[PDB]
Amino acid sequence: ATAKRLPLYYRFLKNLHASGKQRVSSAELSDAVKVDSATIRRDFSYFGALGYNVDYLLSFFRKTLDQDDVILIGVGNLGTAFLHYNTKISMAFDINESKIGTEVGGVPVYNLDDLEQHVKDESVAILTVPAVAAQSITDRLVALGIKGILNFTPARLNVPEHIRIHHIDLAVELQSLVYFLKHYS
Amino acid sequence: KIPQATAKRLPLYYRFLKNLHASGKQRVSSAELSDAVKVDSATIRRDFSYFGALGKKGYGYNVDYLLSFFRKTLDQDEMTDVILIGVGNLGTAFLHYNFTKNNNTKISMAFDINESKIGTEVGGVPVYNLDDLEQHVKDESVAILTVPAVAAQSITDRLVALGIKGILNFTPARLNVPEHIRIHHIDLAVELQSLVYFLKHYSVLEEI
Ligand SMILES: Nc1ncnc2c1ncn2[C@@H]1O[C@H](COP(=O)(O)OP(=O)(O)OP(=O)(O)O)[C@@H](O)[C@H]1O
Ligand SMILES: Nc1ncnc2c1ncn2[C@@H]1O[C@H](COP(=O)(O)OP(=O)(O)OP(=O)(O)O)[C@@H](O)[C@H]1O
């Protein structure tokens, strides 16, 4: 639970640091993030913060996050390239019963039907299915609390704005490069 | 070298012919062509020799023939033919990519070193031996790299020598190329690590 509160603090203190403030009280933080005074002080003791030093905490939060994941849907050429490319992909999903129940790149392939039961804490999804499948899958992912999607499909996804989408597409990349070549060469 | 002056006249001829064809006109003379682009009949003869356009004495030029001829010529000139190197998982996904018509871009050929793939067609694109790269590449300006990182640089040196001006690098290799060469580097692993980083830190990962 402490690690679910740490992000709330990190977000606010980032903002605080941005506005110049070198110190923060447990009451300031409580009002800003709606965690009670006492829980904050208890957490900050556990973080070794002895007025609290804003930079101490931000540095602590940042190191913690860096010291301590991902699912993939569509185990075809692109997905396999990803499962073989050289932050662990822990589970993959497909609809091909030939692939369901095998491991590719050491990662087990499950039935898409099991997505809701199997996904718990994972926050990142790689999407390597045909564009036609992408929106319905994305809708299910956002419902299961996935927070970022690597969309390696031609589909332009409809998502809440807080869902981070990294869109990778061959035609989109090529359009841009060709434009440069045709205009700035 | 088709002369610049000739090459610049090609879209002019085409626009003129477009209008003639819409008007129901069946034949066009050298003089009518000359009036259209403001040159003389001898220029038309020379320009048409450079384009390979054919007429019949007296009759002149068939408007339908010439319009489709000039359209086929402009389409080819404006098409982006792309070369792909490395027909593994990633490269075969790309050779199966369906580019829309609106987009005159296609992958025209591919190269590999695997004997089982060389001499085959994948998504309608022929797969050739990398050794023959210099004998297949003529005017193509864009290449896609989907080879292991350790092979990417030697290949890139060859491409830039053959006149490739732009590369999509889907490999981990950080490529060394002259200043004018345009590269987009897409490392799939790094793209994944970037998404994970942002969700932890709400700032964008510094790469390299
Ligand atoms: N609705 C879906 N949910 C999950 N996976 C899917 C869905 N539709 C397709 N896939 C999977 O996405 C992958 C990519 O689909 P695609 O049709 O491009 O196959 P592919 O890469 O050519 O590979 P293969 O030749 O092995 O089918 C395949 O493994 C396919 O089974
Ligand atoms: N120097 C090279 N020039 C051209 N192709 C190469 C070169 N080196 C490796 N390749 C090819 O690049 C492609 C991608 O390499 P990789 O080792 O990732 O194979 P892969 O994606 O696992 O595909 P597959 O399972 O079909 O071998 C392969 O088709 C391989 O045969």
Side-chain angles (χ1 to χ4, degrees), chain B residues 120-187:
Chain B
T120 213
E121 276 180 19
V122 177
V125 53
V127 185
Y128 296 127
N129 201 313
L130 195 71
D131 291 352
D132 295 341
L133 182 69
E134 282 71 26
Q135 281 94 69
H136 284 110
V137 180
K138 260 88 219 71
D139 281 321
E140 300 81 11
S141 207
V142 180
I144 296 168
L145 246 38
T146 53
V147 297
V150 67
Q153 185 65 60
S154 321
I155 292 176
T156 301
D157 291 351
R158 284 161 77 178
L159 288 179
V160 294
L162 283 165
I164 293 293
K165 299 282 186 279
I167 299 242
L168 303 185
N169 175 20
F170 286 88
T171 91
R174 306 155 186 173
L175 299 178
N176 301 320
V177 295
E179 276 193 339
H180 68 293
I181 297 305
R182 186 54 143 171
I183 303 177
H184 291 199
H185 188 192
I186 306 97
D187 181 321

Side-chain angles (χ1 to χ4, degrees), chain A residues 10-11 14 61-70 76-78 80-82 84-87 89 123-126 147-150 152 154 162 164-166 168-178 180-182 185, chain B residues 77-80 82 88-90 92-94 96-97 99 103-105 107 141-144 165-168 170-172 180 182-204:
Chain A
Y10 191 24
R11 283 177 154 178
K14 271 187 77 213
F61 298 154
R62 181 173 166 189
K63 189 66 169 158
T64 299
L65 281 167
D66 279 338
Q67 301 173 125
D68 254 20
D69 200 334
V70 174
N77 289 124
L78 248 31
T80 302
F82 239 114
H84 290 166
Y85 213 87
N86 262 182
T87 183
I89 300 158
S123 312
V124 177
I126 297 160
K147 289 288 175 283
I149 301 169
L150 193 159
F152 202 165
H162 64 278
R164 182 93 168 172
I165 303 297
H166 288 8
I168 309 300
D169 183 80
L170 188 60
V172 155
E173 290 301 324
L174 279 171
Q175 193 178 118
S176 177
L177 183 69
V178 172
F180 179 94
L181 296 177
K182 291 195 166 292
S185 287
Chain B
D77 300 356
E78 294 160 14
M79 180 68 48
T80 301
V82 179
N89 287 307
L90 197 54
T92 111
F94 293 168
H96 296 142
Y97 198 97
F99 291 98
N103 183 8
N104 42 56
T105 303
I107 301 172
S141 207
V142 180
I144 296 168
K165 299 282 186 279
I167 299 242
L168 303 185
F170 286 88
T171 91
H180 68 293
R182 186 54 143 171
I183 303 177
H184 291 199
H185 188 192
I186 306 97
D187 181 321
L188 300 186
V190 174
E191 301 292 355
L192 176 56
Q193 114 174 252
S194 288
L195 214 196
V196 168
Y197 189 93
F198 181 92
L199 292 178
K200 285 188 186 258
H201 296 294
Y202 298 102
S203 73
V204 170

